[PDB]
Amino acid sequence: MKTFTAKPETVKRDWYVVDATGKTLGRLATELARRLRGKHKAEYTPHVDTGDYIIVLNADKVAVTGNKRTDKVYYHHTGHIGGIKQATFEEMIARRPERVIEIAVKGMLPKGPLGRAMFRKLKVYAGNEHNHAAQQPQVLDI
Amino acid sequence: METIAKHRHARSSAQKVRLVADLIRGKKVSQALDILTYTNKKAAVLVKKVLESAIANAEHNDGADIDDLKVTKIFVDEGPSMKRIMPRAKGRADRILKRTSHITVVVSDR
Amino acid sequence: NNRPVYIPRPRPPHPRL
Amino acid sequence: AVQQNKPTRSKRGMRRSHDALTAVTSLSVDKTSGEKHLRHHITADGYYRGRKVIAK
Amino acid sequence: VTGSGKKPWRQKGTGRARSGSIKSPIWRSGGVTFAARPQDHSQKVNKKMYRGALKSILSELVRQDRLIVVEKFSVEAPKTKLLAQKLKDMALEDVLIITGELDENLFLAARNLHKVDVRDATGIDPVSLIAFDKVVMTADAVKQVEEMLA
Amino acid sequence: ARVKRGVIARARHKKILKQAKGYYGARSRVYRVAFQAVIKAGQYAYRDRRQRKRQFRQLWIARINAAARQNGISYSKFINGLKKASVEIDRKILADIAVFDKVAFTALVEKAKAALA
Amino acid sequence: MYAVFQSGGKQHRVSEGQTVRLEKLDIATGETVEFAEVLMIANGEEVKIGVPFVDGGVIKAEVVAHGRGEKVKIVKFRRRKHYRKQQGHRQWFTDVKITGISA
RNA sequence: GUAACGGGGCUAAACCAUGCACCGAAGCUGCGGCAGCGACGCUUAUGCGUUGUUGGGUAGGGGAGCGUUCUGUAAGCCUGCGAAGGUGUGCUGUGAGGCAUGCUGGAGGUAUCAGAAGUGCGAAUGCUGACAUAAGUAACGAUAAAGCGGGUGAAAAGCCC
RNA sequence: CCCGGCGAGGGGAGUGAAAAAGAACCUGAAACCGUGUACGUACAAGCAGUGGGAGCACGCUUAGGCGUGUGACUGCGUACC
Numbered sequence: 022m023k024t025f026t027a028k029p030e031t032v033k034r035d036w037y038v039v040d041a042t043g044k045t046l047g048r049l050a051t052e053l054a055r056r057l058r059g060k061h062k063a064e065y066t067p068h069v070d071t072g073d074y075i076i077v078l079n080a081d082k083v084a085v086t087g088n089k090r091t092d093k094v095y096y097h098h099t100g101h102i103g104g105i106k107q108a109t110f111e112e113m114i115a116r117r118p119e120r121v122i123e124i125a126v127k128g129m130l131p132k133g134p135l136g137r138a139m140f141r142k143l144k145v146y147a148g149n150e151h152n153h154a155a156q157q158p159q160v161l162d163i
Numbered sequence: 164m165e166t167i168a169k170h171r172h173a174r175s176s177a178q179k180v181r182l183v184a185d186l187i188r189g190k191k192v193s194q195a196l197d198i199l200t201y202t203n204k205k206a207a208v209l210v211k212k213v214l215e216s217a218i219a220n221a222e223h224n225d226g227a228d229i230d231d232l233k234v235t236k237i238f239v240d241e242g243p244s245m246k247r248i249m250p251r252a253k254g255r256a257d258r259i260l261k262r263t264s265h266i267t268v269v270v271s272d273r
Numbered sequence: 274n275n276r277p278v279y280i281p282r283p284r285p286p287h288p289r290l
Numbered sequence: 291a292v293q294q295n296k297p298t299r300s301k302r303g304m305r306r307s308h309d310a311l312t313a314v315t316s317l318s319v320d321k322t323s324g325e326k327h328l329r330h331h332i333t334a335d336g337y338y339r340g341r342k343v344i345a346k
Numbered sequence: 347v348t349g350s351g352k353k354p355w356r357q358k359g360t361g362r363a364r365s366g367s368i369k370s371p372i373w374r375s376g377g378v379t380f381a382a383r384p385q386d387h388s389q390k391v392n393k394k395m396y397r398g399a400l401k402s403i404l405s406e407l408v409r410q411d412r413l414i415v416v417e418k419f420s421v422e423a424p425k426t427k428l429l430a431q432k433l434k435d436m437a438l439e440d441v442l443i444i445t446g447e448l449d450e451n452l453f454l455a456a457r458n459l460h461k462v463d464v465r466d467a468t469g470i471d472p473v474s475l476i477a478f479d480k481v482v483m484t485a486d487a488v489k490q491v492e493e494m495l496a
Numbered sequence: 497a498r499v500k501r502g503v504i505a506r507a508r509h510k511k512i513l514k515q516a517k518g519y520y521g522a523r524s525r526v527y528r529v530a531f532q533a534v535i536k537a538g539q540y541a542y543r544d545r546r547q548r549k550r551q552f553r554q555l556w557i558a559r560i561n562a563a564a565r566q567n568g569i570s571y572s573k574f575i576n577g578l579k580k581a582s583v584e585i586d587r588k589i590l591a592d593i594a595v596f597d598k599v600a601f602t603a604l605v606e607k608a609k610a611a612l613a
Numbered sequence: 614m615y616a617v618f619q620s621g622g623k624q625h626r627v628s629e630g631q632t633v634r635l636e637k638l639d640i641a642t643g644e645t646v647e648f649a650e651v652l653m654i655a656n657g658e659e660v661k662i663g664v665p666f667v668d669g670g671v672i673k674a675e676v677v678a679h680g681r682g683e684k685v686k687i688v689k690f691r692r693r694k695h696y697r698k699q700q701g702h703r704q705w706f707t708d709v710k711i712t713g714i715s716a
Numbered sequence: 717g718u719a720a721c722g723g724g725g726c727u728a729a730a731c732c733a734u735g736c737a738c739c740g741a742a743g744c745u746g747c748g749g750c751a752g753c754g755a756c757g758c759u760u761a762u763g764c765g766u767u768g769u770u771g772g773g774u775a776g777g778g779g780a781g782c783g784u785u786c787u788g789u790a791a792g793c794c795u796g797c798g799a800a801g802g803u804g805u806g807c808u809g810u811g812a813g814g815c816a817u818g819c820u821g822g823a824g825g826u827a828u829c830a831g832a833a834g835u836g837c838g839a840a841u842g843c844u845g846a847c848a849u850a851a852g853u854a855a856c857g858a859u860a861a862a863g864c865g866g867g868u869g870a871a872a873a874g875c876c877c
Numbered sequence: 878c879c880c881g882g883c884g885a886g887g888g889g890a891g892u893g894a895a896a897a898a899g900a901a902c903c904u905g906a907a908a909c910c911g912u913g914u915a916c917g918u919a920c921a922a923g924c925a926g927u928g929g930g931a932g933c934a935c936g937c938u939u940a941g942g943c944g945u946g947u948g949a950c951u952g953c954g955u956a957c958c
Binding site for chain 9: 521537540542543551
Binding site for chain 1: 920921929930931932949950951952
């Protein structure tokens with residue numbers, strides 16, 4: 022008969038902490054995307070945000086193999102006459118280290134209001150200190 | 164109690180009289196009366212006459228004590244349109260629609 | 274309700290030769 | 291200088307939304323005659339600020 | 347169609363569809379692409395087919411017992427009441443009286459009433475025979491019909 | 497014999513309009529435009545009568561993969577173990593079991609592992 | 614108290630005392646139907662099939678309805694090829710009530 | 717405007733050899749429902765305890781059907797405790813359709829089988845009537861020019877002095 | 878009889894089977910224009926639909942869905958001749 026469909030109101034969202042020190046950028050981002058989409062839960066629903074909240078620390082310590090650290094160019098356009106700007110991985114880390122992780126996770130995630138809601142759960146902090154201790158965010162070994 | 168009142172075949176256009184009707188929609192009789200009196204529109208007096216007719220009907224043909232009366236349902240509707248031919252340039256002929264509107268005011272105590 | 278009897282001749286087309 | 295396609299009643303209503311007027315909501319009662327009049331305007335009978343101003 | 351062969355408007359330049367005359371079928375007050383004409387709907391039926399159909403309908407009537415053969419059937423006076431009684435006593439309402447020799451008394455009696463009709467032996471039609479529920483036959487009429495059928 | 501077709505035309509138009517009822521804009525008001533919607537709606541329904549099977553198969557596979565990875569085994573290995581154990585259960589009932597009863601899915605996974613090893 | 618059985622090529626998850634709409638069967642409307650092909654019998658303790666169709670399990674159910682499914686319209690249309698086809702369908706169903714589950 | 721992996725991103729998530737698993741179509745298989753074609757065991761103007769197969773389709777060819785005006789059936793039947801049209805609903809048939817009814821209506825309609833079409837509209841820069849669109853936008857028709865006071869009138873800048 | 882401007886129209890009364898049969902007058906649909914009700918919508922992009930789909934508003938036997946309206950989100954989906 023009718024297959025089970027998780028109801029958004031009765032969804033249990035847990036808090037996890039993932040360390041970005043000595044971690045491959047893409048391999049961490051894909052795991053974060055899986056956690057956000059809730060593919061690890063037995064009650065996964067494509068049209069419901071059944072994922073969990075993850076707090077990423079030490080984002081500036083994320084490592085990229087090879088020469089990507091110098092030859093990885095994050096382009097973007099401002100929608101203007103010639104507003105195309107290119108920033109290398111080192112420049113992005115120097116300016117703000119959380120944005121590289123945020124962009125990677127956003128690219129991993131699907132597009133749409135549901136994807137934006139899934140991305141909304143991410144809280145990336147450059148340092149090792151977080152202000153979400155009140156939610157009992159037990160660390161995740163990954 | 165319905166105590167309906169309407170003025171069919173009104174010259175004013177419905178599109179321009181709905182603006183005045185919305186101002187008094189759902190307000191007390193006295194407030195609507197003064198708003199229509201001090202509104203700077205021909206439709207203002209056009210609908211004030213209908214409101215006066217409705218309140219007089221309530222006074223005479225129905226229960227007295229107009230004090231506890233409210234304009235519950237009021238709506239403006241288009242009416243029959245008269246065709247007029249206006250000469251234009253290059254010998255072209257266009258048709259002018261003299262639009263008329265039907266205005267209905269329903270006042271009830273509750 | 275008479276259909277427009279006279280219709281002006283179309284504006285000459287721009288030279289496209 | 292002409293429309294490619296007919297706009298819809300939804301867009302028409304959205305455009306007309308801002309055409310609605312606003313009530314004065316500033317009816318002032320004369321101190322002496324106790325008559326309603328526009329603020330900073332003389333009454334119909336010709337009374338303003340209690341004293342008469344039109345003498346007619 | 348009354349009108350004019352003049353084109354409603356010049357063939358080119360106008361911002362309207364091409365037209366040749368107001369009498370066009372796709373125009374109001376005039377048209378009809380294929381107007382009907384006075385035609386004869388008469389259908390050629392061979393004498394053999396007519397005789398075969400008449401014999402078949404008579405055989406069907408006899409098999410269903412709807413055909414009745416009686417002796418001289420006449421009315422003394424041209425009064426419809428006498429015919430009505432002579433039919434009611436015999437228990438027949440919708441019946442065709444076929445007589446070898448037509449009698450004015452019976453003809454006048456049956457002219458007004460619709461449930462009862464009178465025809466000569468020569469003047470018989472399969473449509474009438476099928477339409478009438480019952481048929482009463484006289485001996486002379488039966489002999490004449492048989493001789494004609496051969 | 498002149499025959500007027502107004503009644504038949506109105507009946508067909510009403511049928512089309514009631515079929516198209518609930519659409520946005522003129523698609524639910526104009527017969528000429530509503531007719532396109534009903535044909536497109538029928539084409540979409542025909543496509544979806546097939547797409548639904550594969551989409552539900554996708555959802556069930558995702559649920560089974562989630563449950564298996566939570567229990568400590570991959571979806572492919574779990575299915576291979578089931579096939580080696582000769583179990584004809586399907587993805588729908590497997591996903592229902594995984595969603596509702598965890599002990600049953602644990603039994604399934606352990607039997608599949610025993611068959612595989 | 615639930616069990617899984619295959620009747621019309623598809624497995625149905627049914628518990629005690631609930632009715633299930635399944636594919637039509639050449640059976641009377643008031644005669645108990647026996648299904649010896651059961652995949653799992655579930656209780657507080659779980660027993661699984663080492664071989665298909667358990668060992669002695671059986672499902673006892675009573676037919677309730679023998680009607681047809683909801684109306685579904687099949688519309689086939691080819692764009693710009695002057696082709697359209699109409700067709701309707703109502704799949705038959707034989708609703709049954711699961712009254713008894715064996716071990 | 718990055719723009720010559722789809723992107724994220726990947727140092728294996730890049731390429732060669734092998735293997736074991738899974739996803740993967742309207743493809744096959746399992747079930748039910750419908751129609752054509754050939755056979756044999758039988759029904760013999762028709763069901764099949766059946767069997768194998770076919771069922772994408774434009775132009776085109778063949779077959780079977782739904783809808784309406786009128787005529788015979790039909791001076792028979794429904795119908796002022798409510799016909800036709802209009803308007804929503806529930807069933808029903810692979811379908812054009814059919815049945816009953818909530819409300820308006822007010823006096824016509826018509827079962828089954830046959831006969832003829834001015835017999836089915838979504839387009840032809842189609843025709844007739846109406847209503848939207850632009851839009852409450854341009855414009856309110858020589859840049860010789862109106863103001864005050866009194867009068868009538870419900871209302872006066874344009875009416876009278 | 879009353880409102881209204883000794884108007885127009887409307888509201889009461891009466892005639893009338895029926896006055897949403899009132900002369901702009903048999904039956905009175907559509908495009909088009911509003912009111913009230915329930916839902917959705919002000920961070921979300923594209924033939925505006927289909928499959929799934931939580932919630933809300935209305936009645937039911939039973940106390941679970943079922944009948945209707947709405948429908949956030951999600952895969953697919955570039956009108957007709």
